[PDB]
Amino acid sequence: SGILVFDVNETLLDLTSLSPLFERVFGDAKVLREWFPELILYSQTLTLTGLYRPFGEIAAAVFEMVAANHQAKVTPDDIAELKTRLTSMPAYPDVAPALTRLQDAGFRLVTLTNSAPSPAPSPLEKAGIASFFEAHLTVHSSQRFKPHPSVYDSTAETLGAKPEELCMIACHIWDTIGAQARGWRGGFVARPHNTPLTLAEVPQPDFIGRDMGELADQLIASLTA
Amino acid sequence: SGILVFDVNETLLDLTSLSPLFERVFGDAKVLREWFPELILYSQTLTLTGLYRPFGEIAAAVFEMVAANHQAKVTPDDIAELKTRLTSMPAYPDVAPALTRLQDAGFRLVTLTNSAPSPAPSPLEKAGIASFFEAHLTVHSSQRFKPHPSVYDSTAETLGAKPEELCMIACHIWDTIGAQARGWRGGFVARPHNTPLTLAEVPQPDFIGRDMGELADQLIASLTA
C-alpha cells in the first residue's frame, strides 16, 4: 500500500507535556510556543552552516537562551527536567487507533525524527507505540536536520524505497515540504496550535486531516479511489 | 579599517514597533516572539528545500498561520497593517550616533537583509539612516536566505572583499554564525529579547556589545589593540 514515515515529536508524542516546566521556570506555559520554533530555527541554522550537535543539546542551549531573554533563572535541575520530559512525551490518544487502522489497511509504518538515538527504551517504546513501526530512523547519521534533502534521501535509501512509495506525515509543514521536495507524498495532521502554512509556489500536502483519525480516513480512501 | 555589514530588521530597526499589531490581533504583544522565529524558521526551510519566495510574502503567510494557531481573526487590513509596520520600523536611537562614530573611524558601512529590494522609500530611508551606508544589499541575488553560505559569499564578491575584511553585525546569533562560517568576523549587539546561543563548537561572536554604542566602541578600540 506504500510506506508512511511519521515525524515523532508533536506529531505522535505530545509536546504540551512540557508545559509545567515552562510554567515553573518562566511563570508562563505559553513560552513553549517561543522556545520550540527557536529550537527548530537553530537546528536549521546549524544545518545550513555545516555544524551539528544532537537535538537535545540544542534544545537545552535554546532553553537557556530563551530563559536569558526573559531574565528567568535556570538551574541544572531545570535542564535535567527538560531532558527527562523531552524524552518521555506521551502519545496522543488518537495515535494507536489510527496506526492500527493504517496497519490493518496494509500500510508499512516507519518513524523519522530530529531526535538523536537513545538507549532502550526510546520515547516511542515508553509511550507504548513503538511496536507499530518496522523501522525507527533518525537524522543523527546524516548530521543534518530536517528539512535537509540528505535526511529524506538517506531514509529512502535505508528503506530501499523509491520516493513514489513514501509519504511523510507530520504536524509541521516544514517537514512535509522537506519530503515533498524529494518526490515523496506529504500528509499533514493538525495538532493543537499547528495549522498548515500556505504560501504561493510551495507544494500543499497530498493529505490533510484535522486529527490522526481524519488523516487515516484520507490515506485509506486513496487506496481504492 | 574594514567593512562592517549590518543586519537591518531588529538589529538597526526596532521590531518591538510591531507589538501593537500583536496586542490587537492576539490580545497579547508577546506573540511577536512566536511569530518572528517562525518567520525565520520558514525562510530557512524554503532555503534548505530549494524554494524561494520574497521575505515579506513569508512574513504574511506566517502571520496568518500563527493567527490560525491562536484561533485569532485576521483580515486583509491586518495584513496591510503588518506590511506598513514591517517596512517602516524606526531606527533605535543608538544607531545614527554609533554609525557616525564608525564612519569617523574609517569603517566602510553596508547593510545586508533578508528583505527583498524595496521600492523607494525603503525601510532604511524612512528611518533616516540609509545614507550612512555605501551599499544596501539583499538576499535577492542569492535567492536564498541567511544563514545560507551563498548569501555571504555573494555579498563578499559584490563588495570585492576578502572574508577577513568583513564583519557581520547582528542581534541574531544565527546571522553571525552564518558569516563566521564563511571566514568573516561577527559582532553581536544585544537588543531586548536577544542574547547569544552558547553551544559547543558553535563559533562565538568576535565582538559583543549591550547596545550599538558599546559595540561601536569595541570595534573602534580593536583598531588600537
Side-chain angles (χ1 to χ4, degrees), chain B residues 59-108:
Chain B
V62 170
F63 192 85
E64 293 153 6
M65 179 191 76
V66 172
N69 294 342
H70 280 259
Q71 295 183 139
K73 193 190 165 189
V74 165
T75 66
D77 292 339
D78 296 331
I79 297 302
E81 181 177 334
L82 176 70
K83 186 186 174 182
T84 295
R85 298 183 175 268
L86 188 51
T87 66
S88 321
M89 302 184 282
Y92 301 93
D94 73 355
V95 173
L99 300 178
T100 297
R101 291 194 293 111
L102 295 163
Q103 224 161 34
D104 290 344
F107 290 105
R108 291 172 54 199

Side-chain angles (χ1 to χ4, degrees), chain A residues 18-190:
Chain A
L18 266 62
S19 293
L21 167 71
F22 287 84
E23 180 82 69
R24 184 173 56 78
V25 172
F26 294 92
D28 180 12
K30 302 192 308 297
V31 175
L32 179 66
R33 302 297 174 192
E34 175 189 352
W35 165 88
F36 188 71
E38 288 283 351
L39 163 58
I40 300 303
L41 186 173
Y42 280 96
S43 74
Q44 294 182 28
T45 281
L46 294 188
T47 296
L48 283 161
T49 60
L51 301 157
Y52 179 84
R53 303 291 320 169
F55 197 62
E57 189 173 329
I58 309 175
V62 170
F63 191 87
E64 296 157 0
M65 187 193 70
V66 174
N69 291 160
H70 281 259
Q71 308 182 50
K73 185 172 166 159
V74 180
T75 63
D77 283 4
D78 299 330
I79 293 306
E81 181 169 347
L82 174 67
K83 178 176 167 183
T84 297
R85 296 195 180 260
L86 196 48
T87 60
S88 311
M89 300 179 292
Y92 298 93
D94 73 349
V95 170
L99 299 174
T100 297
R101 295 174 55 210
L102 292 168
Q103 191 157 64
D104 290 356
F107 285 107
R108 292 166 61 188
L109 311 174
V110 175
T111 56
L112 173 62
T113 183
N114 276 336
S115 295
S118 77
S122 67
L124 290 163
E125 281 174 318
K126 297 174 211 172
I129 61 163
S131 62
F132 286 103
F133 302 96
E134 70 171 56
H136 294 284
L137 303 179
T138 82
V139 304
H140 195 69
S141 77
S142 296
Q143 295 213 136
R144 293 166 162 172
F145 290 100
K146 296 162 170 188
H148 194 286
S150 284
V151 169
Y152 307 100
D153 293 349
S154 62
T155 296
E157 180 193 3
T158 294
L159 298 172
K162 299 185 207 147
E164 69 184 328
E165 300 165 339
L166 295 161
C167 184
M168 189 77 213
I169 294 166
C171 67
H172 304 117
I173 282 284
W174 48 263
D175 204 353
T176 54
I177 284 165
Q180 290 181 64
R182 308 313 295 164
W184 299 26
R185 278 177 174 88
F188 181 85
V189 52

Side-chain angles (χ1 to χ4, degrees), chain A residues 34 44-45 69 193 195 201, chain B residues 34 44-45 53 69 193 195:
Chain A
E34 175 189 352
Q44 294 182 28
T45 281
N69 291 160
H193 215 106
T195 60
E201 204 217 318
Chain B
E34 172 181 349
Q44 297 179 23
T45 282
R53 297 304 309 177
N69 294 342
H193 221 95
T195 51

Side-chain angles (χ1 to χ4, degrees), chain B residues 21-216:
Chain B
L21 174 61
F22 288 87
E23 173 80 310
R24 177 178 68 77
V25 174
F26 295 88
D28 183 5
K30 302 194 297 306
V31 174
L32 175 67
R33 299 306 176 181
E34 172 181 349
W35 166 84
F36 189 72
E38 293 271 9
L39 166 52
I40 300 308
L41 191 165
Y42 275 98
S43 74
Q44 297 179 23
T45 282
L46 300 199
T47 301
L48 281 166
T49 61
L51 296 172
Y52 180 85
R53 297 304 309 177
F55 196 62
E57 289 191 27
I58 311 175
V62 170
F63 192 85
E64 293 153 6
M65 179 191 76
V66 172
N69 294 342
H70 280 259
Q71 295 183 139
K73 193 190 165 189
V74 165
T75 66
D77 292 339
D78 296 331
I79 297 302
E81 181 177 334
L82 176 70
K83 186 186 174 182
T84 295
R85 298 183 175 268
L86 188 51
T87 66
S88 321
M89 302 184 282
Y92 301 93
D94 73 355
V95 173
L99 300 178
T100 297
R101 291 194 293 111
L102 295 163
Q103 224 161 34
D104 290 344
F107 290 105
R108 291 172 54 199
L109 311 180
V110 174
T111 54
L112 175 62
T113 184
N114 277 333
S115 299
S118 155
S122 68
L124 294 162
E125 291 178 292
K126 289 189 220 149
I129 61 169
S131 60
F132 282 105
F133 303 97
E134 66 158 42
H136 305 102
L137 305 178
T138 77
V139 301
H140 177 77
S141 70
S142 294
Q143 296 279 293
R144 286 176 171 162
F145 289 101
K146 301 161 166 187
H148 193 284
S150 297
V151 178
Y152 306 102
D153 299 354
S154 66
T155 298
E157 175 69 11
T158 289
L159 304 167
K162 287 158 73 192
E164 71 192 49
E165 298 178 76
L166 301 162
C167 185
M168 186 77 212
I169 294 173
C171 71
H172 305 116
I173 203 92
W174 51 263
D175 202 358
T176 57
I177 290 171
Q180 292 174 232
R182 307 313 290 174
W184 302 24
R185 286 180 250 276
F188 181 87
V189 52
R191 287 296 186 202
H193 221 95
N194 294 271
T195 51
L197 181 79
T198 300
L199 182 60
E201 72 202 30
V202 161
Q204 289 201 319
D206 298 290
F207 305 97
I208 200 172
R210 290 166 287 180
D211 51 59
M212 198 62 88
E214 180 172 66
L215 180 62

